[PDB]
Amino acid sequence: NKSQLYPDSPLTDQDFNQLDQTVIEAARRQLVGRRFIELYGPLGRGMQSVFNDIFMESRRVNYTIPMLYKDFVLYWRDLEQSKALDIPIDFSVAANAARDVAFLEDQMI
Amino acid sequence: NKSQLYPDSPLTDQDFNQLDQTVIEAARRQLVGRRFIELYGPLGRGMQSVFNDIFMSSRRVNYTIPMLYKDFVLYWRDLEQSKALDIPIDFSVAANAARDVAFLEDQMIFHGSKEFDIPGLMNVKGRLTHLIGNWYESGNAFQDIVEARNKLLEMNHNGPYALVLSPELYSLLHRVHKDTNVLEIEHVRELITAGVFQSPVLKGKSGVIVNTGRNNLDLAISEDFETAYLGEEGMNHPFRVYETVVLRIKRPAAICTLIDPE
Amino acid sequence: NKSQLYPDSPLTDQDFNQLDQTVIEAARRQLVGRRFIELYGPLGRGMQSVFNDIFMESRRVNYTIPMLYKDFVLYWRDLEQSKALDIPIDFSVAANAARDVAFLEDQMIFHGSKEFDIPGLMNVKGRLTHLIGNWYESGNAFQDIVEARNKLLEMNHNGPYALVLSPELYSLLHRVHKDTNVLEIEHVRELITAGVFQSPVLKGKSGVIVNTGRNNLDLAISEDFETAYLGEEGMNHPFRVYETVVLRIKRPAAICTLIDP
Amino acid sequence: MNKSQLYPDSPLTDQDFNQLDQTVIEAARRQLVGRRFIELYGPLGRGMQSVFNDIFMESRRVNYTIPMLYKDFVLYWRDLEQSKALDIPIDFSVAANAARDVAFLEDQMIFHGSKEFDIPGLMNVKGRLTHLIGNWYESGNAFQDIVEARNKLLEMNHNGPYALVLSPELYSLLHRVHKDTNVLEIEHVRELITAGVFQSPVLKGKSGVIVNTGRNNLDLAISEDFETAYLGEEGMNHPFRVYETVVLRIKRPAAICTLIDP
Amino acid sequence: NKSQLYPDSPLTDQDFNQLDQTVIEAARRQLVGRRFIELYGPLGRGMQSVFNDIFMESRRVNYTIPMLYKDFVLYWRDLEQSKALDIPIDFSVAANAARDVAFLEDQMIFHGSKEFDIPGLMNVKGRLTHLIGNWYESGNAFQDIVEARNKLLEMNHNGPYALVLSPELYSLLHRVHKDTNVLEIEHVRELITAGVFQSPVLKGKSGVIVNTGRNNLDLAISEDFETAYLGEEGMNHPFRVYETVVLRIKRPAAICTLIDP
């Protein structure tokens, strides 16, 4: 899981799931491309390019798969304060980044 | 096993082994690119394209792995006669098919795959270019190799180098060096430690010096020289000798091509 | 074995083996064709003609297999004297016959069988021809081979090459090269991997370079060198050293011919 | 003692690091010329950041700071994941390029020194013997100039075994045949120089050096051999570094004879 | 052993053996006198002078055995640093001293000990002298050795001969002979069976041919190359590589000397 994938992560397993759920919910609320376009996958990490057969009214074109990303930063002072006061970790910046990856996909689509 | 993979093949298990050996030997003898260019292993099925990082800071290009194949037919009349008389099957057509594919691979290695946008050693962008003088005069050929070898040194390529020349130019280092009273091929072989090779794919007075090493260039083998039964057609048994190979030139500056100015 | 194959043979099993060993040794010492041409066989007695696929730079031609033989005679007086004195039987005449079958094969391999219309190395259509200059001057012989080998290389025939020269040209290769302090034959032997041979069948200044490989040319043998009793005739014991061989040139472009103008 | 525990954050397993080590080491061995005729003094260890050299001129102690030679290459995470998914061995081509560059750096430091730390080289050390060679294109000059150079070492109380390293052009010129003996000059030289006649791209033009092999004459002081260290993961990619710490000590400068073109 | 011989030695038994092996190897790589002169010993520490019977072409002379030594110093800071870092002790200075004792023996063997009045190969009375010509011209070096070896042969000294030349003359032997396509040194090496050596002790154009054999000349060693602790002085550890050797030339007529006019 995430905890063993990033042993140095300040977020625990429960804290990291909230990071995933916040990102997933923010993506679904903004992904308009996936609302009507079917998904061919998940292919997996072993695929870096796909072959597209264009039937004009066939032509085979090798479409390399782009990677769209947004970074965002979780400041340590906020994380330490949340741990000290036993309050849930704020992931508002994480949702903002997901809204920008979902906007990048829509621009690319 | 090829026996169970082609249940309808007329050849037995041992006959396929002889057919495979004939194809392998004919290809290996006729292949000049693989002598000095290393193989990026058997990629196998599931890798239809490969990525080449071109260094001139690197840039990435997606290279589609093309299929090179030649078709040969084993006539049933000849097959039945060999089985009846217990004489070995003549796979001379198989050897010619492997020879033709090997010639095709060498053309793809040197002159590139134009229809697949894959460059070759003789036309890769960014390669060094050297102009050879009159190699008919003794000593000019050695000096040209020295000048071209120094050109690769200027671009941080210390060797070991491999030199491939056209047959017309190759049959010019087989002359006594008047300065040293030795064959000019021997002096070049001392400088070119990876060997000097000929190739019919090069026409006229052309040649290329390649700094050997898997970090400069290699061949991505999706599947090595393999034979496949195309299925019975008109009572005969056609086979396909096919291979899936692409050439990756990671550092084009490691290739210096000798070009006749005329 | 031979004793039961020819019950009337004056030679015993041991005596007949010496006949075979003498014939075999005399054949190997003279067969220059088999030194670089691969054997397609032994097919057996059930094959009398072979199919040759000529790839010109396919054409199927039915090559009937010729039979080459020499007879020789073992006189009974010599055989009786040897038995009486307990000395080994002299097979010098047998070796002489084997030297003539091995010369007949070389003639058929290099010049072809006119009666059966089978081509040879020096005669086949579709071969490459190189006109040699004056090999007497040192250094010309190496250059002529270099240019002739270049013609084979331009046809995607990258060796290994086998060069057969007439004894006049073969001896001309033994002079020291011009300015490389090395015998001219040694430099050619580096160029020709399969070896440089000589054959008396080639007359004058002539030679041939053949790109070896059974996919280029091969030798079809239904039966190798064999000795057969022809039956006693006039108290003598005539035999026959025979073989059924034929040369199949599948790739005529793999043969480069050196001739003089 | 495996590098997996040394770099827990590395993406390579025990076997992948092992394949990485051979790729770096083999590419280094193919290019390291100085190590062929110079003994290795070490590995001293991480506690030796500078070595002491006692020069016996024909005694002065000089402190040499051990230089660190390195080159960086990056393995892309997409490539590592793609190879891992397809069960294909990782492509360490960039590692060989980095290892080859470091090997050239060590050879360049051995011969031409290191101006940054004022460490002398074979062709730069003070007190060495200098021999002005002649036209090696003409016959006999190549062997004679070596004989006088060896005589210079003999007069300086150094009686072998010698090691001769020549520029790549001069090494080929030694393959000529002798004017009278009708034997190649290289075998005559090889009988005089029994530690081996080598060639190196570092020497340019008509240049060479004759070195009296022996620990008491000169040696390589290394604290860390060719080692691949995993740098921190940056930008989701994995950058590595092939580094080594080697300094050359010439205890007897008079045991080195340099062939210099006038 | 060494540890109990010098209880105050900073070097352990393993460290002291490396001192001995370094000294021994450096001596063998430089001792040209012992390559052809037989050893009469080790006599032992109980012998300080030897009797030489000179057979001129007997005379008894008491040759006192000289002692040749070089000191060198092992600094304590280097020894302490090596112990702290667990690295082997550097003995480069020790090898340098051994190269100077092996040069002192060669000087004493070839030129003699003037202080003890002991003759050498190049200096003894009763030797044969040959005046070499111009060795620069090819073929003169071989001829000069031939005539000089002839002088030894006329004195019933029929080999095996050992020839030692100065580096100037030794390198002059490496040119190809005049018209025999063979290196001049190779022809001399055929003439001189015991081998042709060179010594830096011989200056200019000079050399010597010695007819080997312990009945002609020998080397008397009471003690071979030895390393002795001289006791700590100024925190340093001075040693001494020493040997007690002397050359006895019993037959001065067995030495032929090559000099230039």
Short mmCIF file of C-alpha atoms in Angstrom, two decimals, chain E:
data_model
loop_
_atom_site.label_atom_id
_atom_site.label_comp_id
_atom_site.label_asym_id
_atom_site.label_seq_id
_atom_site.Cartn_x
_atom_site.Cartn_y
_atom_site.Cartn_z
CA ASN E 1 64.08 -14.54 14.06
CA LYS E 2 64.07 -10.79 13.42
CA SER E 3 61.53 -9.95 16.13
CA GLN E 4 63.63 -11.52 18.89
CA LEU E 5 66.84 -10.25 17.28
CA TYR E 6 65.62 -6.63 17.58
CA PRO E 7 63.06 -6.55 20.41
CA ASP E 8 62.78 -2.76 20.08
CA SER E 9 61.99 -2.93 16.36
CA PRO E 10 58.72 -1.12 15.51
CA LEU E 11 58.14 -3.69 12.74
CA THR E 12 56.45 -6.97 13.64
CA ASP E 13 57.47 -10.33 12.18
CA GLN E 14 55.19 -9.90 9.16
CA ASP E 15 56.29 -6.29 8.72
CA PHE E 16 59.96 -7.26 8.95
CA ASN E 17 59.63 -10.02 6.35
CA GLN E 18 58.24 -7.46 3.90
CA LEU E 19 61.36 -5.41 4.65
CA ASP E 20 63.49 -8.43 3.76
CA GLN E 21 61.49 -9.36 0.65
CA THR E 22 61.60 -5.78 -0.63
CA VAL E 23 65.37 -5.64 -0.08
CA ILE E 24 65.94 -9.06 -1.65
CA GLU E 25 63.84 -8.32 -4.74
CA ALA E 26 65.47 -4.93 -5.28
CA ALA E 27 68.91 -6.53 -4.96
CA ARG E 28 68.22 -9.34 -7.45
CA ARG E 29 66.84 -6.88 -10.01
CA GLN E 30 70.14 -4.95 -9.85
CA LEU E 31 72.86 -7.54 -9.10
CA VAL E 32 74.57 -8.14 -12.45
CA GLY E 33 77.70 -9.57 -10.85
CA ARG E 34 75.90 -12.59 -9.40
CA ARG E 35 74.26 -13.43 -12.75
CA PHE E 36 77.43 -15.17 -13.98
CA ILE E 37 79.86 -15.29 -11.02
CA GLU E 38 79.44 -18.29 -8.74
CA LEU E 39 79.02 -17.84 -4.99
CA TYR E 40 81.59 -19.27 -2.56
CA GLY E 41 79.52 -19.35 0.60
CA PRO E 42 77.79 -18.38 2.77
CA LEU E 43 81.00 -18.78 4.78
CA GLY E 44 79.50 -17.28 7.94
CA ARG E 45 80.33 -14.58 10.43
CA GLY E 46 83.46 -16.42 11.57
CA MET E 47 85.37 -15.46 8.41
CA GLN E 48 86.73 -11.94 7.95
CA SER E 49 89.41 -12.54 5.30
CA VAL E 50 89.88 -15.06 2.50
CA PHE E 51 92.98 -16.42 0.78
CA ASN E 52 93.13 -16.00 -3.00
CA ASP E 53 95.51 -18.14 -5.06
CA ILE E 54 96.34 -16.19 -8.22
CA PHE E 55 97.43 -18.48 -11.07
CA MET E 56 99.20 -16.17 -13.51
CA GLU E 57 99.85 -17.16 -17.12
CA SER E 58 100.73 -19.64 -7.54
CA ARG E 59 100.58 -16.40 -5.54
CA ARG E 60 98.66 -16.38 -2.25
CA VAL E 61 97.11 -13.06 -1.20
CA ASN E 62 94.99 -12.53 1.92
CA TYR E 63 91.89 -10.63 0.76
CA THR E 64 90.07 -9.06 3.69
CA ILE E 65 86.32 -9.06 3.09
CA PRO E 66 84.88 -5.53 2.80
CA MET E 67 81.45 -4.59 4.12
CA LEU E 68 79.12 -2.60 1.86
CA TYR E 69 76.11 -0.94 3.45
CA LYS E 70 73.38 1.64 2.97
CA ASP E 71 71.41 3.05 5.87
CA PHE E 72 68.01 4.59 4.94
CA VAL E 73 65.51 5.68 7.62
CA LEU E 74 61.96 4.61 8.47
CA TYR E 75 60.24 7.71 9.86
CA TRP E 76 57.97 7.11 12.85
CA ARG E 77 55.17 9.37 11.61
CA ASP E 78 54.78 7.20 8.51
CA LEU E 79 54.84 4.03 10.62
CA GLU E 80 52.26 5.40 13.06
CA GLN E 81 49.97 6.55 10.24
CA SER E 82 50.16 3.14 8.58
CA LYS E 83 49.27 1.39 11.84
CA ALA E 84 46.36 3.75 12.50
CA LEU E 85 44.89 3.36 9.00
CA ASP E 86 45.69 -0.39 8.83
CA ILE E 87 47.57 0.03 5.54
CA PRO E 88 50.80 -1.82 4.65
CA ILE E 89 54.06 -0.11 5.58
CA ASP E 90 55.79 1.67 2.71
CA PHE E 91 59.30 0.32 2.10
CA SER E 92 60.19 2.38 -0.97
CA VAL E 93 63.18 3.92 0.82
CA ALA E 94 64.32 0.42 1.80
CA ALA E 95 64.31 -0.69 -1.84
CA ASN E 96 66.28 2.43 -2.79
CA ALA E 97 68.98 1.53 -0.26
CA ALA E 98 69.16 -2.02 -1.61
CA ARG E 99 69.64 -0.59 -5.11
CA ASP E 100 72.66 1.27 -3.75
CA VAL E 101 74.24 -1.76 -2.06
CA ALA E 102 73.71 -3.71 -5.29
CA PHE E 103 75.37 -0.80 -7.10
CA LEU E 104 78.26 -0.78 -4.59
CA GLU E 105 78.87 -4.50 -5.11
CA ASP E 106 78.91 -4.04 -8.88
CA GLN E 107 81.37 -1.16 -8.53
CA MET E 108 83.56 -3.31 -6.27
CA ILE E 109 83.26 -6.36 -8.54
CA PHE E 110 84.02 -4.48 -11.76
CA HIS E 111 86.42 -1.77 -10.54
CA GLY E 112 87.74 -3.12 -7.23
CA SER E 113 87.95 -1.84 -3.66
CA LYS E 114 90.76 0.72 -3.54
CA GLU E 115 90.71 1.01 0.26
CA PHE E 116 91.27 -2.74 0.76
CA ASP E 117 93.34 -3.06 -2.45
CA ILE E 118 91.16 -5.74 -4.06
CA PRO E 119 91.21 -5.88 -7.88
CA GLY E 120 88.19 -6.01 -10.15
CA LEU E 121 87.27 -7.37 -13.56
CA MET E 122 88.17 -4.10 -15.31
CA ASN E 123 91.28 -3.53 -13.17
CA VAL E 124 93.00 -6.80 -12.18
CA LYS E 125 96.61 -7.34 -13.25
CA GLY E 126 97.18 -10.21 -15.67
CA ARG E 127 93.95 -9.74 -17.62
CA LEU E 128 93.69 -9.66 -21.41
CA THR E 129 93.04 -6.34 -23.14
CA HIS E 130 91.35 -5.84 -26.51
CA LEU E 131 91.11 -2.41 -28.14
CA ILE E 132 87.70 -2.05 -29.77
CA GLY E 133 87.36 0.01 -32.93
CA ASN E 134 84.25 1.97 -33.93
CA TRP E 135 81.18 0.04 -32.81
CA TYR E 136 78.86 2.61 -34.41
CA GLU E 137 79.38 1.05 -37.84
CA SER E 138 77.35 -2.14 -38.06
CA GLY E 139 79.30 -5.39 -37.94
CA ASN E 140 82.27 -3.98 -36.02
CA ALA E 141 80.79 -4.93 -32.65
CA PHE E 142 80.50 -8.60 -33.60
CA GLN E 143 84.02 -8.64 -35.06
CA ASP E 144 85.53 -7.03 -31.96
CA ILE E 145 83.92 -9.66 -29.73
CA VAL E 146 85.11 -12.41 -32.09
CA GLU E 147 88.74 -11.27 -31.93
CA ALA E 148 88.53 -10.63 -28.18
CA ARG E 149 87.04 -14.08 -27.59
CA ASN E 150 89.86 -15.48 -29.74
CA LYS E 151 92.39 -14.12 -27.24
CA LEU E 152 90.68 -16.08 -24.47
CA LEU E 153 90.62 -19.17 -26.69
CA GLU E 154 94.37 -18.90 -27.30
CA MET E 155 94.85 -19.14 -23.51
CA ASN E 156 93.01 -22.49 -23.29
CA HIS E 157 89.84 -20.77 -22.04
CA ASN E 158 87.16 -22.42 -24.18
CA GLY E 159 84.07 -20.96 -22.51
CA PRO E 160 81.37 -20.61 -21.42
CA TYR E 161 81.91 -16.85 -21.73
CA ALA E 162 79.96 -14.05 -20.07
CA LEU E 163 80.10 -10.60 -21.67
CA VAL E 164 79.23 -7.43 -19.74
CA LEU E 165 79.09 -4.16 -21.66
CA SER E 166 78.38 -0.56 -20.78
CA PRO E 167 74.85 0.59 -21.70
CA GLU E 168 76.26 2.65 -24.58
CA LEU E 169 77.86 -0.46 -26.08
CA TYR E 170 75.02 -2.76 -25.02
CA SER E 171 72.47 -0.67 -26.91
CA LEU E 172 74.83 -0.51 -29.90
CA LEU E 173 74.52 -4.30 -30.16
CA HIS E 174 70.78 -4.07 -30.91
CA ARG E 175 71.19 -2.83 -34.48
CA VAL E 176 70.67 -5.29 -37.32
CA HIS E 177 73.90 -6.87 -38.57
CA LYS E 178 75.41 -5.73 -41.85
CA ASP E 179 74.32 -8.40 -44.34
CA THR E 180 72.99 -11.25 -42.20
CA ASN E 181 69.41 -9.93 -41.58
CA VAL E 182 69.80 -10.84 -37.89
CA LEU E 183 70.16 -8.55 -34.87
CA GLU E 184 73.80 -8.08 -33.92
CA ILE E 185 72.99 -8.87 -30.29
CA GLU E 186 71.54 -12.24 -31.33
CA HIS E 187 74.78 -13.28 -33.04
CA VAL E 188 76.79 -12.22 -29.98
CA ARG E 189 74.35 -14.08 -27.73
CA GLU E 190 75.10 -17.21 -29.76
CA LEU E 191 78.82 -16.62 -29.19
CA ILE E 192 78.49 -15.82 -25.47
CA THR E 193 76.70 -18.75 -23.85
CA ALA E 194 76.38 -17.39 -20.30
CA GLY E 195 74.52 -14.34 -21.60
CA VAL E 196 75.22 -10.73 -22.51
CA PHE E 197 74.54 -8.34 -19.63
CA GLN E 198 74.91 -4.61 -19.09
CA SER E 199 76.03 -2.63 -16.06
CA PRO E 200 75.82 1.14 -15.46
CA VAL E 201 79.10 0.92 -13.52
CA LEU E 202 81.01 0.69 -16.81
CA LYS E 203 81.44 4.22 -18.17
CA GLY E 204 81.76 5.21 -21.81
CA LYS E 205 82.60 2.55 -24.39
CA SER E 206 83.88 -0.32 -22.25
CA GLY E 207 83.18 -3.98 -21.62
CA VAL E 208 84.58 -7.26 -20.36
CA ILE E 209 84.43 -10.92 -21.38
CA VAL E 210 84.84 -13.38 -18.50
CA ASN E 211 85.28 -17.13 -18.88
CA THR E 212 82.83 -18.47 -16.31
CA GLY E 213 83.63 -21.20 -13.81
CA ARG E 214 84.29 -21.24 -10.08
CA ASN E 215 87.83 -22.45 -10.81
CA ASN E 216 88.44 -19.16 -12.68
CA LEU E 217 86.68 -16.62 -10.46
CA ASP E 218 84.19 -16.77 -7.61
CA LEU E 219 82.33 -14.59 -5.12
CA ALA E 220 83.00 -15.04 -1.39
CA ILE E 221 80.02 -14.09 0.77
CA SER E 222 80.30 -14.29 4.54
CA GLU E 223 76.82 -12.75 4.83
CA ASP E 224 74.39 -11.96 2.02
CA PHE E 225 71.99 -9.02 1.83
CA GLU E 226 70.85 -8.43 5.40
CA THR E 227 68.81 -5.71 7.11
CA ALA E 228 69.81 -4.70 10.64
CA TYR E 229 68.16 -2.27 13.04
CA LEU E 230 70.58 0.47 14.10
CA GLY E 231 68.44 1.49 17.08
CA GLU E 232 65.91 4.30 17.34
CA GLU E 233 67.49 7.74 16.92
CA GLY E 234 65.48 10.96 17.09
CA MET E 235 62.18 9.03 17.12
CA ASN E 236 63.19 7.61 13.75
CA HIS E 237 64.08 3.98 13.01
CA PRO E 238 67.30 3.80 10.98
CA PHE E 239 68.17 0.44 9.46
CA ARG E 240 71.14 -0.83 7.45
CA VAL E 241 71.14 -2.99 4.33
CA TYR E 242 74.61 -4.53 4.38
CA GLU E 243 76.61 -7.36 2.86
CA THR E 244 80.17 -8.64 3.22
CA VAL E 245 81.34 -9.70 -0.24
CA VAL E 246 84.66 -9.90 -2.09
CA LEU E 247 85.66 -10.99 -5.60
CA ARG E 248 88.44 -13.56 -5.95
CA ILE E 249 90.01 -13.63 -9.42
CA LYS E 250 91.97 -16.87 -9.38
CA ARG E 251 92.73 -16.87 -13.13
CA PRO E 252 93.31 -13.31 -14.43
CA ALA E 253 93.93 -14.76 -17.91
CA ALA E 254 90.23 -15.71 -18.06
CA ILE E 255 89.17 -12.04 -18.28
CA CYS E 256 89.32 -10.14 -21.57
CA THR E 257 88.84 -6.38 -21.30
CA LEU E 258 87.37 -4.22 -24.07
CA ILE E 259 88.41 -0.55 -23.97
CA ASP E 260 88.52 2.33 -26.41
CA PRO E 261 91.75 4.14 -27.41
#
